[PDB]
RNA sequence: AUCCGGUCGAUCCUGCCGGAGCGCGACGCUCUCCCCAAGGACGAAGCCAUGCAUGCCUCAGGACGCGGCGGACGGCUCAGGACAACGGUUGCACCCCCCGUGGCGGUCGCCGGACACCGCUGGCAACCCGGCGCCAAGACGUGCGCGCAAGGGCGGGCCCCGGGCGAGCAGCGUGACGCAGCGACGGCCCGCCCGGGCUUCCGGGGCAUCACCCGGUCGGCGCGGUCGCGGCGCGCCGAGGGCCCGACGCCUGGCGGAGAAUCAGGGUUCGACUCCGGAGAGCGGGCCUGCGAGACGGCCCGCACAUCCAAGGACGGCAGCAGGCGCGGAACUUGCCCAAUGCGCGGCGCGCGGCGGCGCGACGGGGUGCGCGCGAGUCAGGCGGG
RNA sequence: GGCGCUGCUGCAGUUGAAACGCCCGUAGUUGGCCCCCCGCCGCCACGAGGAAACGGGAGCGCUCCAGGCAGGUUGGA
């Protein structure tokens, strides 16, 4: 091309947003922000797919402009906007406070939670870097930047942050025996306890978690989200990261019909 | 593009002139518009553009679509550019405590 | 680094390498068929003048992924921008190895790396091979035969992207065969 | 125009390829400024904007003599000798890396102290001072130096030698 | 592009290689006598869908007896040739699905389930009653001939409460 | 997981010729009802009449105009290009990046004048423009401010090995230059994000009646240029580099993949067109504006073709949607609409796309009876639909 | 596809078409037996990571069907 793309087929969508192949040739497309386009899911794809508060994309427009909708505490007026991970969704009118998470299948999925929950949020450290004038700076998942952080915070750690100062309250350290979730892969959505951490010099780093029924599993170390120490932070779904097989799967699913 | 039909000659189907040091000069054709910038109004009236009352709201124009004054310093407008300046200075001082937090910090550590 | 300097009582005898650097830097200085003064962008030239030998006079460095700098690199006195200890380039990406096919250039020689290809209708297997060029420093000198581990750097020539950072001797008259590894 | 695109060449082994579509506005290049000595600098609008400076006929610089740190601002006076050709020393052209004679009169202040170089003391006591231009001047629009010494003086004293 | 060419389509039936092999000429003529069929491509169509089921169960067979692909899929292969009435409840080996022929696929048609009732006295009067929209399945009524009707849903193969046989 | 007819006076073989199945187009004949659905690709990337395909919101009743964001995305095609492109797999410690989302914000008393819309006059066949004059800004220009943009000299250890690495990387101090950007409604700058540029390894058509090929070709040194590395370019130095594990040359009615047709297993053939990537806009070149283009519903030039004209001049690009000519065996309406799915500005826009029309390319279901009740049609009301 | 008349699985070469007049010989292909419990290939298995549509395939009566992703706590494994 010529210049930045705008547009996105339906076919081309990711397959974890579960778009339907007829009615539509065109998919939202993430505008940027705090998440990428490949790990998120448009705002719209929440209000009007999910929970039919609106039907079409005209009349979900109508309640971004009014401001019924809080992001992390914020008013988000732009329908493709990109929500993600421990984002906080709170609608006040219905008096909804849901966290975004992962579920059994790689998918994204709404906890309710307490307005004693909702006033924080957990974020991953990505990077420790020396800005203008050698200052110190850190980056999380979040596209978040924290000047002069406490010398112990280093990377793969996550830091707890208050939602309307915006600033550091307590940190997990990434270590062995933590409490874990993996954010992406094949793997996705599980919750398990970290049992090794190999380093390949040039390579990848991988890491062998394992559930709490004791199934054992392995991803890249760029996958992993420190949840606690011993005790998840926050709440989980019902499953609370346990995977069935395809035959308890579908003894399940031919129990609903019944 | 296509240009220039003559340095004056005889092609030349129009010309276009100006008089100057003046059948002979008579009609004194009337000015449309008004002075609309703030000091626009104040040398047209000899007022000084410096005092702390430079409100000048005076309406005739002669009744005479167009009038809006435009740059002139009101009591709000004042405000905001105080509120302005006093907040970037608020930036400053907190970041200072914040350097001297952290310098403070690693000398303890 | 917790250990801290063993005591031998002949290390500052040792360091007349001072001296040797020096006058090989005036040596240099002397070949006027050059048309350019070659020196390393890491070292002043102010440090040759003085005396009380407080300061180094030549610079190296070392690559990482456990490989170790030959001690030839340490203690030459060539110049060289695109050797890879004491040059001004860095090793990332993908390390092979090979065998040297020819070392007929200047600072240049060319592997040949080799492998199978499975075909599947046949069930069976071709043997297939490839040339790769790259850097060889002064710190190391090879023959045909040797095998060689080189490791990516960025763009160097037209056809060079790797450059020599291991040499594993290969006696002459023995005979050739795959070798794949 | 000019371009840096790699489509126009051989390949390794002497053969002829093919062209597969047009000019491409990012592989451009530029013609070189050929800074003159004895001041202009021009701007570039470049990819993203990104200013670049690009000197013609420059007079002045900063230099150092680096051993005892004495850092004056100085008038080049003449460019006498270039690795790449004679050419460039004929003309007096400004380039990264070439050797000129400086205007000994900012350093005369720095007469009195011994124990510093009499190849560069005895260089002061006279009208000018062998340098090296240290940065692009087509590039930042600038040409700064240092003040050579130790073998590297020698090799270019023998490069000038009067024979 | 439009939508529509996202849309997907199949042919549904196999011809056979030799047209013209007497046996099998009058074997498939006895068949459009004792149902009521209208052309041969309704031959096709049975043959073709048990060439499938026949595919599957020879591909799990070839596995071995603790493998979860046999565990799961000979599992839904059994439990969906069940309701159908395609194969019977005493026969839950996956060796017994092999020796099915096509009359078990054409006895669980629409016009063949109420000739068995005697709510038609014949096949042929079966299927003009069929068109008729004069008879319903579990109160909805149905106008397909070939319908397949399950197990859940032949006790409640009536005529239709609105029709002028009522 | 199948064969059958044809050589002889008769017989057993080798061996081909012919028949029997599925798919894709074209031709012929014929056709009741309903659902789905392709449709000028096929050595003419040949030529085009007409209309439509890009607009939406700081300073006065409104327009108009100025200013701003977008027009580089979306649509079409397969001409070129065979160690390309493309697919998987690496890297940038050689890079650039609008919007959006976090940060950060220290810089050696309210200024000026003038341009368009518009008035008064004109030229011209028409295309298009001239002169004089009153008038604004979230437009410019200059700037009030606690010094700090780029580049440059010194600040490393002379077995071997946190700010941050596998890797001496990034910051800072200190001597010299320089005076950039942001300030008249406070933003220069920094991280992420998407996108791009190149880049490592493996795969990546046929012909030997194409056996030797290359000479910026292969490497080194130094500068220039570039967003940036690099024979990318230039000066100098050396003689390298590739090849029967098929180089080089020539040919292709050659776009690549995801895939598709056929059918025991192993295979054979095709990859125009739906998604992803690449390239082009009659053919060569060149360029401006912009974060982003070597843009063609932007500009300039040569060539080959057309257009209007008072003869002076002016002027064009359907491989966009319909439609036409030509060519071919071969391919539809010069319809209605932004109601949906999405995109730009926020309320509109949109031949993207949606809905009807023509449509036996092809798919799926039901009829032309049964032992006596239906469907195809007809007329009304619903439901559906901008 | 038939076609084991292109043959890797899997053709034919005394006489049906087909073994170079013969010997040497480089590239290529191939190479007896033996030590087990190290390293480096190949090879087998299991993982990680990257795209959907298509193709398989779990569950669901668009009246059936070619379809579609529905639906009555759910689901698109
Ligand atoms: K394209
Ligand atoms: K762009
Ligand atoms: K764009
Ligand atoms: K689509
Ligand atoms: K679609
Ligand atoms: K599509
Ligand atoms: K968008
Ligand atoms: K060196
Ligand atoms: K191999
Ligand atoms: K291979
Ligand atoms: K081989
Ligand atoms: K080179
Ligand atoms: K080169
Ligand atoms: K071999
Ligand atoms: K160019
Ligand atoms: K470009
Ligand atoms: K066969
Ligand atoms: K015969
Ligand atoms: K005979
Ligand atoms: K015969
Ligand atoms: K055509
Ligand atoms: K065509
Ligand atoms: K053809
Ligand atoms: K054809
Ligand atoms: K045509
Ligand atoms: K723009
Ligand atoms: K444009
Ligand atoms: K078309
Ligand atoms: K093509
Ligand atoms: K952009
Ligand atoms: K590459
Ligand atoms: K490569
Ligand atoms: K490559
Ligand atoms: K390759
Ligand atoms: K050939
Ligand atoms: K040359
Ligand atoms: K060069
Ligand atoms: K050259
Ligand atoms: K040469
Ligand atoms: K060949
Ligand atoms: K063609
Ligand atoms: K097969
Ligand atoms: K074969
Ligand atoms: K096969
Ligand atoms: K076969
Ligand atoms: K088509
Ligand atoms: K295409
Ligand atoms: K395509
Ligand atoms: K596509
Ligand atoms: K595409
Ligand atoms: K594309
Ligand atoms: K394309
Ligand atoms: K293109
Ligand atoms: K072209
Ligand atoms: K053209
Ligand atoms: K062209
Ligand atoms: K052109
Ligand atoms: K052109
Ligand atoms: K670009
Ligand atoms: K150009
Ligand atoms: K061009
Ligand atoms: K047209
Ligand atoms: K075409
Ligand atoms: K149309
Ligand atoms: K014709
Ligand atoms: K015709
Ligand atoms: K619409
Ligand atoms: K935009
Ligand atoms: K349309
Ligand atoms: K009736
Ligand atoms: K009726
Ligand atoms: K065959
Ligand atoms: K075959
Ligand atoms: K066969
Ligand atoms: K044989
Ligand atoms: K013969
Ligand atoms: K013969
Ligand atoms: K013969
Ligand atoms: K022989
Ligand atoms: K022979
Ligand atoms: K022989
Ligand atoms: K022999
Ligand atoms: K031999
Ligand atoms: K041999
Ligand atoms: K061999
Ligand atoms: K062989
Ligand atoms: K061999
Ligand atoms: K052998
Ligand atoms: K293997
Ligand atoms: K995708
Ligand atoms: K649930
Ligand atoms: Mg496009
Ligand atoms: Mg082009
Ligand atoms: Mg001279
Ligand atoms: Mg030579
Ligand atoms: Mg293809
Ligand atoms: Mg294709
Ligand atoms: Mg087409
Ligand atoms: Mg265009
Ligand atoms: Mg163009
Ligand atoms: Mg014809
Ligand atoms: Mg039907
Ligand atoms: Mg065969």
Known sequence: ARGVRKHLKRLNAPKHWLLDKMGGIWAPRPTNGPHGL????????????????????????????????????????????????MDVFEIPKVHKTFRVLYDVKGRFTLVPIQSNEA??????????????????????????????????????????????????????????????????????????????????????????????????????????????????????????????????????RLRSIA | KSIRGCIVGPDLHALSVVLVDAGLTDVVVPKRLVPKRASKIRRLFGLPTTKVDPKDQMLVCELILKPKVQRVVTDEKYARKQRVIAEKKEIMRKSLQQLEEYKALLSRM | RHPLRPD??????????????????????????????????????????????????????????????????????????????????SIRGRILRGVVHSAKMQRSIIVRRDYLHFVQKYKRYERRHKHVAAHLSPCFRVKEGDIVTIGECRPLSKTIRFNVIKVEPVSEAAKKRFSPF | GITHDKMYKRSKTGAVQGKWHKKRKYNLGRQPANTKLIQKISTIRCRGGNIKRRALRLSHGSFAWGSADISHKARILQVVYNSTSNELVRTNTLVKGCVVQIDSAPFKSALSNDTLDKEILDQIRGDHILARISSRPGQVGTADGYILEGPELLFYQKKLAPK | PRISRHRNSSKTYSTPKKPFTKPRLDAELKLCGEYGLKCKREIYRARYMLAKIRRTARNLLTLDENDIKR???????????????????????????????????????????????????????????????????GGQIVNIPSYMVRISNTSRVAIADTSSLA
């Open chain 1, 38 to 85: 490949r790990e998120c899911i448009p705002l719209i794809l929440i209000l009007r797919n999910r929970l039919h508060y609106a039907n079409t994309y005209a009349e979900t427009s109508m309640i971004l402009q009014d401001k019924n909708v809080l992001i992390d505490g914020k008013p988000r007026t732009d329908p493709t906007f990109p929500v993600g991970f």
């Open chain 1, 119 to 252: 006033g924080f949020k957990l974020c991953r450290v990505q990077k420790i870097f020396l800005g203008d004038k050698g200052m110190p700076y850190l980056s999380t998942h979040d596209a978040r930047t924290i000047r002069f952080p406490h010398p112990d915070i280093k990377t793969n750690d996550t830091i707890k942050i208050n939602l309307k100062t915006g600033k550091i309250d307590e940190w997990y350290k990434f270590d062995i025996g933590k409490i874990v979730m993996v954010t992406g892969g094949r793997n996705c959505g599980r919750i398990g306890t970290i049992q090794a951490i190999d380093k390949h010099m040039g390579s990848y780093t991988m890491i062998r978690m394992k559930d709490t029924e004791g199934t054992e599993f392995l991803t890249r170390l760029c996958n992993v989200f420190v949840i606690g120490n011993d005790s998840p932070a926050v709440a989980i779904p019902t499953t609370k990261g346990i995977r069935p097989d395809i035959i308890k799967n579908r003894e399940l």
């Open chain 3, 8 to 89: 031998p009582d002949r290390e500052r005898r040792a360091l007349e390498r001072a001296e040797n650097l020096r006058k090989a830097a005036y040596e240099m200085a002397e070949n006027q068929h050059e048309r350019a003064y070659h020196k390393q962008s890491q070292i002043f030239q102010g440090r040759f003048l003085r005396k009380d030998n407080a300061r180094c006079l030549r610079f190296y460095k070392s690559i990482g992924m456990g490989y170790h700098t030959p001690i030839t690199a340490i203690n030459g006195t060539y110049i060289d921008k695109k050797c890879p200890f004491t040059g001004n380039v």
């Open chain 5, 71 to 137: 565990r799961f899929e000979g599992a839904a292969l059994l439990r969906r040739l069940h309701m159908l009435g395609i194969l019977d409840e005493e026969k839950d080996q996956l060796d017994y699905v092999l020796g099915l022929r096509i009359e078990d696929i054409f006895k669980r048609r629409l016009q063949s389930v109420i000739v068995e009732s005697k709510l038609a006295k014949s096949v042929h009067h079966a299927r003009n009653m069929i068109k008729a929209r004069h008879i319903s399945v």
